[PDB]
Ligand SMILES: CCCc1cc(=O)oc2c(C(=O)N3CCCc4ccccc43)c(OCCN3CCN(C)CC3)ccc12
Ligand SMILES: CCCc1cc(=O)oc2c(C(=O)N3CCCc4ccccc43)c(OCCN3CCN(C)CC3)ccc12
Ligand SMILES: Nc1ncnc2c1ncn2[C@@H]1O[C@H](COP(=O)(O)OP(=O)(O)NP(=O)(O)O)[C@@H](O)[C@H]1O
Ligand SMILES: Nc1ncnc2c1ncn2[C@@H]1O[C@H](COP(=O)(O)OP(=O)(O)NP(=O)(O)O)[C@@H](O)[C@H]1O
Ligand SMILES: [Cl-]
Ligand SMILES: [Cl-]
Ligand SMILES: [Mg+2]
């Protein structure tokens with residue numbers, strides 16, 4: 190009952206381990222339906238049991254690799270390895286490495302600063318209108334903190350040096366930094382052993398692997414001109430449209446016919462597909478290659494254009510409410526947004542208003558006409574008169 | 576384009592001001608439909624334009640006051656004052672004050688510690704199964720940081736002293752601490768001037784006041800044995816049922832029939848009301864007096880019991896899917912949850928699994944029978960006819 194037991198102050202690192210949820214999501218098991226890529230049937234929707242926080246620390250490193258394609262458009266490949274037996278994951282990318290040099294203000298080598306100190310980022314100057322997913326200066330450190338071993342290797346031909354250093358025990362200590370002369374092709378490679386005890390797991394099991402493999406497919410579908418490999422296996426995705434087809438290729442509507450898909454690449458920062466849903470409103474969307482699984486104003490901005498036009502039509506031919514049109518829709522959106530905001534570090538819901546996007550996404554009259562003719566108007570029209 | 580310009584490190588305080596969104600929500604204007612309490616009108620649903628972060632710093636202090644009723648059941652009153660002309664908000668509560676004594680580990684007085692230092696809390700020991708809303712040790716400091724003036728006054732008969740101190744300039748400095756002898760009835764009073772420049776606002780305008788007044792009514796409805804005053808006038812709310820009645824009194828469905836309202840106080844930690852919606856699924860819910868406006872597993876837990884029973888009734892008389900039943904429901908839930916988790920500091924979505932709630936909420940056979948004759952089954956069965 191002492192005042193010192195009751196009222197306690199935590200360090201930032203202590204707080205992350207004590208209160209992980211707002212940083213990485215739940216550290217308890219969840220059982221829910223998800224899209225996964227299974228070793229035998231591929232992309233499919235099924236019940237899975239997994240720990241969100243474990244999935245998220247993988248996501249943080251993977252999105253960081255996609256971010257390097259905006260930093261260096263000459264980057265060409267991402268290679269992911271997953272080794273359940275040794276509890277080992279690595280994510281490698283080419284294109285420009287991280288500068289191997291001492292930071293004159295923070296007085297340590299740049300790779301050690303930005304992987305080993307909290308609140309460090311190249312995304313803190315919003316006069317730079319960037320379409321990277323990184324915003325807060327946490328993600329890589331969060332992966333470090335929830336790993337028993339975390340290694341950073343990055344090679345910079347500009348500085349003619351390669352950097353390598355390892356952290357251990359939830360970012361509680363580090364081994365010696367290794368510097369070596371370098372004159373080859375730049376790359377960065379992050380290799381980590383997740384702290385499965387913090388997630389109450391015994392190994393990287395079937396479900397979490399299938400989620401991680403699907404997330405790699407996401408990256409292959411949402412990035413431009415980046416080849417993605419998983420354990421050496423090239424992921425056979427060319428464009429966002431071919432990614433979308435993996436979800437639809439084989440299912441038919443409840444009446445029995447194949448799904449009609451409306452598509453437009455609106456500009457270099459927006460691509461949209463629309464089909465029908467039998468499960469209520471559904472959206473699969475990405476902002477700067479982040480999976481925005483709770484949606485956000487980018488989904489609203491696109492979906493509302495469609496809804497308003499379809500509601501206009503049923504009025505001409507008739508009382509109809511927006512939510513009734515929306516619950517027939519399955520929308521896919523791939524967007525590049527300048528300096529996005531989200532509700533949380535996990536970046537599931539993108540909250541930035543359209544006036545700040547840095548681009549527009551006005552669907553064409555052709556897209557809209559095809560949406561009017563996809564059957565939603567007819568279904569609702571028959572409903573109202575009845 | 577130097578390394579020091581590109582890669583930057585922030586202090587915790589700098590980061591909060593630079594990246595407010597995951598701490599307090601958006602600091603930009605939002606225009607959306609909300610429930611408010613308008614002068615001379617009462618509770619009503621209309622479009623409002625407001626800044627979420629401003630609403631949230633008020634919420635943090637108001638929930639802290641409600642939390643003290645769990646700490647000290649002798650507490651009886653919360654008094655809220657809103658003064659737009661002088662840009663002043665004040666929130667007062669009685670029951671036990673904060674101990675006015677030097678913390679022997681942190682070497683400063685307890686009120687100064689827990690209102691002026693980040694990551695300070697009495698809620699960090701989860702072996703204590705508490706139903707306070709406080710979890711993370713941020714809320715009061717976030718209000719301080721987003722205020723130009725922030726005053727803490729608290730009186731502790733146990734220590735025979737009263738404490739008073741003012742912070743200024745986004746928690747950048749503090750004035751002189753005042754300690755005085757005290758031997759009366761304990762209270763705490765938090766008075767702050769929000770830094771409207773951080774929210775691009777000029778005054779506490781009609782819409783934000785109407786949201787804040789409604790939030791005071793929420794507290795009157797969601798707490799037990801606490802009188803609530805707004806600018807010195809007692810709010811005429813008794814229990815949660817009388818609060819819900821402010822939303823539903825005299826409301827009709829689209830065909831002009833009165834809404835049917837089903838109610839059960841299931842136990843001392845759960846109270847539920849159900850009626851019909853014509854706007855898709857709607858939920859108004861509270862966890863530990865926090866408004867959970869994105870919902871969470873407490874809403875799912877209650878709503879899914881209802882959905883599954885109604886779906887079964889429809890199958891007896893018939894194809895129908897759960898989401899179709901759910902989109903006819905408007906549910907109200909007031910819950911007390913042990914050590915809840917959320918996606919973010921703003922605590923809009925409660926993520927804790929039901930097996931960890933610390934209590935159950937199995938709706939009675941009487942409630943379920945009334946819900947079956949609610950008019951939802953009717954609506955659905957007219958649809959399958961078409
Ligand atoms: C904590 C886990 C958070 C999460 C991470 C992630 O990566 O994916 C998630 C996906 C998912 O599988 N995808 C696949 C592609 C990425 C993506 C982008 C946006 C939305 C969804 C997805 C997901 O799907 C549920 C889809 N059903 C919801 C119910 N509805 C009636 C039927 C549809 C739910 C959560 C996540
Ligand atoms: C950033 C702002 C977050 C927020 C804070 C807050 O306090 O209330 C909010 C309320 C609201 O007014 N209430 C009243 C009582 C408290 C409460 C608890 C749970 C849910 C709602 C509410 C709200 O209502 C939207 C209701 N429509 C959603 C669309 N649907 C088709 C029709 C209904 C949306 C956000 C907030
Ligand atoms: N693969 C990579 N190649 C090059 N630079 C990288 C790579 N991964 C990370 N970085 C850099 O390391 C910094 C820190 O990464 P991280 O901790 O994830 O913060 P962030 O990505 O900026 N923001 P967030 O992920 O939203 O918390 C980034 O800002 C990048 O500059
Ligand atoms: N009105 C009050 N009466 C008594 N104690 C209070 C009051 N307001 C705040 N406190 C105490 O001050 C501490 C700090 O408050 P706060 O910064 O809001 O953190 P919190 O409520 O514990 N967690 P959170 O709000 O989720 O960030 C709380 O843990 C309480 O112990
Ligand atoms: Cl989010
Ligand atoms: Cl939340
Ligand atoms: Mg990152």
Ligand SMILES: [Mg+2]
Nearest residue numbers: 639709714715
């Ligand atoms: Mg609090």
